[PDB]
Design a protein around this nucleic acid. Structure first.
Lengths: 37, 48, 185, 43
RNA sequence: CUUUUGAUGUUAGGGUAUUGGCCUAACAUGGCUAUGACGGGUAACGGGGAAUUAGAGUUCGAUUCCGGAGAGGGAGCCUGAGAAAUAGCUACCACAUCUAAGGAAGGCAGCAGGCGCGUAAAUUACCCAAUUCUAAAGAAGAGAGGUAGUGACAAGAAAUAACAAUGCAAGGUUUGUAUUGGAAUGGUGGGAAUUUAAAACCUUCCCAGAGUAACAAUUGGAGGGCAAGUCUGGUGCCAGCAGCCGCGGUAAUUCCAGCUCCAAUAGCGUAUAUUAAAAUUGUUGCAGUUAAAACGCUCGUAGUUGAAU
RNA sequence: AAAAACCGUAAAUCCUAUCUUUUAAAGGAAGGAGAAGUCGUAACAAGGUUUCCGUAGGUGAACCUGCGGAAGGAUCAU
């Protein structure tokens, strides 16, 4: 969403690592798209 | 309006405990599959 | 195609359906004016709100404004003609103070009960339904009839009513009595 | 796979009739009955 | 973006009923655009209007009237004052009728009606008497239009009783309340007057014609919101209920039933959409340290706003 | 009158291109919901290595580490 990421009051996954994992997934998806096209 | 495909029991949420008797309907307008809840106590066996 | 005959609502639903105090006062009003259903007093409030809105709008205008000296006088004369205002009234502020009982006083059943004729308000209602009463030269069987200050002087039994001088009584009972008398004699 | 219990309590409920009673009066007389039974007897 | 293929303009002409790039020829390079051009979407015909409205507003408007458009989809044309007409013609596409197989003939988004589609919508009725139009203009026609039929789309009025005596309760001989028991009256049936083009309806009059006035009112609820039961049986985390919070494992005020009660009432629920509620779209009138939300910072054009005299 | 030609109006069919909407699919990779499943203990206490940010690399997983920040810190303080 906006700039209220992290803010761990909910006791959830660390936002930094969630972002890193999402970025890894996006890199893999981009590679797959490039291979397909 | 739709055509009944088959009857199915569906779990209630965690705090509750029940097997709600719903039905699966193929609509006539588009042929879409939907799930519709059958109200009443014994009305499930009263539909074919 | 579509008919040009206008038509409109006469009552507004109350909203907040289960207000205890409002329900209790409505029951008071309908029980003590002998009316039949909760729609009737709602029509009465609808009407009263119409006159009240007219009066409020008029009072917003300044004095000596032709709109005021036209609409206000029309409204005042209409109200005093229906009998909701006395001769002691002269202003629109007095119009603004009209109340539900002051409007329900002019119902035909209320008026006939007040004048006598029927010894109960429900008796008055049923008589009006059985068309036994006249407002002078014309007989009306609508209990919600609103009388004007020139009508209460001539509310009385309909000439075609048994209590107005028509056919005396139960023809079945009278025929049975006369047949028995003739057979015995 | 438990649709065989539909209408369990509906079918297990004992059946009792609705008797006769008096005709329940309606209309303006119903309102008058509520009115006087609410405001007259109480004291 | 537009501009070869007219886009913007000039000149001359053609064409038209007339002006016009409407078209032609020559010439010029113009014309529109963040004040949103050009595109895309619309489950978009526009307006008079409708719902909701304290005031602002928000949503709707196929649909009485006005304007536009169309007659299966396109195009073309004759007559005519008036048509690019469609219950006029010509052709093509898609449908589709008769045929002796050679050939003919069609257009209900006019009124009825049928199929299909669907959650979703009426009679293959009567009449030109009213309104009005056309004519060779009282006198003929008119599915225009009017009348009736179906019609819980909506809207208005309004039955399902009322009254007297004891008995009972309440009160200093006043109210409510099971018995009796006579009046009133529609609903309904029949005849008539009337109405109507004819008929029907309404209205009115006369006969019959209510006591369990069987001439019987229902719908939805009774934990809270939210008016009304911790009454009685059944079930026992099952069945089920429940918009939300929740109820249900042996006392279930919530399920399934009976009784009672509540609300609305010839109406009452349900679904979807919409308005208020919503000052949760905030012009009036929101919020931005921490609840969602001040661009990392500064410059800066459009925009918005700008001392006094 | 047939018939023909030529400009014009131009239906319709076909080819090509583009756009719009719907839709199939081996495989891949997410999200949500369900159940008492397996593995660990990441966060909340100084959560037992303070937490978090941006970035980069690594690891079965939560996560770890480097650099520079913040206190929303466990310090408003010789």
């Amino acid at each position: 969403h906006g700039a209220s990421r992290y803010k761990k009051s909910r006791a959830k996954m660390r936002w930094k690592w969630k972002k890193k994992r999402t970025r890894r997934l996006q890199k893999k998806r981009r590679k797959m798209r490039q291979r397909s096209r | 309006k739709g055509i009944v495909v088959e009857k199915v029991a569906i779990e209630a949420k965690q705090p509750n405990s029940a097997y709600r008797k719903c039905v699966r309907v193929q609509l006539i307008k588009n042929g879409k599959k939907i799930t519709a809840f059958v109200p009443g106590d014994g009305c499930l066996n009263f539909i074919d | 195609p579509k008919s040009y005959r206008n038509y409109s609502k006469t009552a507004r639903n109350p909203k907040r359906p289960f207000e205890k105090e409002r329900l209790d006062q409505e029951l008071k009003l309908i029980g003590e004016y002998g009316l039949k259903n909760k729609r009737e007093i709602w029509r009465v409030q609808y009407l009263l709100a119409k006159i009240r809105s007219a009066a409020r709008y008029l009072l917003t205008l300044d004095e000596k404004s032709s709109k005021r000296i036209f609409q206000g006088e029309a409204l005042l004369r209409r109200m005093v003609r229906q009998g909701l205002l006395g001769e002691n009234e002269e202003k629109l502020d007095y119009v603004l103070g009209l109340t539900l009982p002051k409007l329900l006083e002019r119902r035909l059943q209320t008026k006939v009960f007040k004048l006598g004729l029927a010894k109960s308000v429900h008796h008055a209602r049923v008589l009006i339904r059985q068309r036994h009463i006249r407002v002078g030269k014309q007989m009306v069987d609508i209990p919600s009839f609103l009388v004007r200050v020139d009508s209460e002087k001539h509310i009385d039994f309909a000439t075609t009513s048994p209590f107005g001088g028509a056919r005396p009584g139960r023809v079945k009972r009278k025929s049975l009595k006369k047949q028995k008398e003739k057979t015995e004699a | 796979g438990s649709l065989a219990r539909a209408g369990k309590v509906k079918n297990q409920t004992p059946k009792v009739p609705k008797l006769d009673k008096k005709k329940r009066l309606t209309g303006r007389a119903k309102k008058r009955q509520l009115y006087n039974r609410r405001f007259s007897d109480n004291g």
